[PDB]
């Protein structure tokens, strides 16, 4: 008859329904493709996970594919189909099957300039997705320009869930310099200084830090490590007020900002002078320093600059908050929760 298709080095084992892969891209643990899908005449994107050595692979797989099964929405990537192994045993690697995107945001600004109305255009859509998962209760963690895929008529949908957790408010605070998961040009300046990422506010400062990217291409706060980070923060930010600092509670962080010398608030448009006035109000309410001023969604959507989209009652939410978190499961139980999680798309 035939045999599975290959790519670079490694079976695409997605057939027959889904034929004629061309390559995309890879991951650490897994690879992405096109393919034409035979049932809906038309192309998707396939990708190959290969998480069952490590549990943190294992942990992530789960994630994405429990929230991303209960979410319905049009800012959103969906999972249209999961293909594995009839059987746990013979299940090494999963498949997932979403919608095809031309491109992605980081592609995109590598390339082109933006027009202020895309720029518009595509933060409506983040905040409206954005709206969405927040009502969830969930927190994305991990929102940057590759994560926000775009089609050919600038669609835009938010993808990769596997840094995702349940919003955890009360258990926000740490100590000083804690270690941290998501990428670093796009975290929040009190994950290096108090927070653990558990308050929706860090998904709104990464959503600014898009915006800033949008406006001149380039990121705006480009750090090359840890601490580095939060240097290029407060060269644009300038100083925390004492109301700001009098927040940090934590003496490390508290003092560590004491020992900086002043640095004066650059004025947005100056980094912007292209930049439409109504969007640099809003980039500033979400890159605020401290995090309980920072806007929330429903504000940033609510703001002027947006208002030739704004819409709450087209602007859906969750019909409940998502809950189950995983930390502690081993890699053979997280198979066995993987695999259960994907029986839906399986023949019989
Ligand atoms: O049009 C073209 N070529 C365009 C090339 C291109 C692209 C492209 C597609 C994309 N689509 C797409 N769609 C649906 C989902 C996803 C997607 C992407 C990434 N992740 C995440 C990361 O974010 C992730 C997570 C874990 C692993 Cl382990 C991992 F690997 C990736 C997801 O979760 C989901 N990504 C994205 C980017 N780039 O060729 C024509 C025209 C040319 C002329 C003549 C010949 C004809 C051919």
């Not at 308050?199 to 990121?219: F, H, Q, Y």
């Not at 003092?255 to 448009?269: A, D, E, I, M």
Request: neutral net charge.
């Amino acid at each position: 008859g035939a045999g599975p298709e290959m790519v670079r080095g490694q079976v695409f084992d997605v057939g027959p329904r889904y034929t004629n892969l061309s390559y995309i891209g890879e991951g650490a643990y897994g690879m992405v493709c096109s393919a034409y899908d035979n049932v809906n005449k038309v192309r998707v994107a396939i990708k190959k996970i290969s998480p069952f050595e490590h549990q943190t692979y294992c942990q992530r797989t789960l994630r994405e594919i429990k929230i991303l099964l209960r979410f319905r929405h049009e800012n959103i990537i969906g999972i249209n189909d999961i293909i594995r192994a009839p059987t746990i045993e013979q299940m090494k690697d999963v498949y997932i099957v979403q919608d095809l995107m031309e491109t992605d945001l980081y592609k995109l600004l590598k390339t082109q300039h933006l027009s202020n109305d895309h720029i518009c255009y595509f933060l409506y859509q983040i905040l409206r997705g954005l709206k969405y998962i927040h009502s969830a209760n969930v927190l994305h963690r991990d929102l940057k320009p590759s994560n926000l895929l775009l089609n050919t008529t600038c669609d835009l949908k938010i993808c990769d869930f596997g840094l995702a957790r349940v919003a955890d408010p009360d258990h926000d605070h740490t100590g000083f310099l804690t270690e941290y998961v998501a990428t670093r040009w796009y975290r929040a300046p009190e994950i290096m200084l108090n927070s653990k990422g558990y308050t929706k506010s860090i998904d709104i400062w990464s959503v600014g830090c898009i915006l800033a990217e949008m406006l001149s291409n380039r990121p705006i706060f480009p750090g090359k490590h840890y601490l580095d980070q939060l240097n290029h923060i407060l060269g644009i930010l300038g100083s925390p007020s004492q109301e700001d600092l009098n927040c940090i509670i934590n003496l490390k962080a508290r003092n560590y900002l004491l020992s900086l010398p002043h640095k004066n608030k650059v004025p947005w448009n100056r980094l912007f002078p292209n930049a439409d006035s109504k969007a640099l109000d809003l980039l500033d309410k979400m890159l605020t320093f401290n995090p309980h001023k920072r806007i929330e969604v429903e504000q940033a959507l609510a703001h002027p600059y947006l208002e030739q989209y704004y819409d709450p009652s087209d602007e859906p939410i969750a019909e409940a908050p998502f809950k189950f978190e995983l930390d502690d499961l081993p890699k053979e139980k997280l198979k066995e929760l993987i695999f259960e999680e994907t029986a839906r798309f399986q023949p019989g």
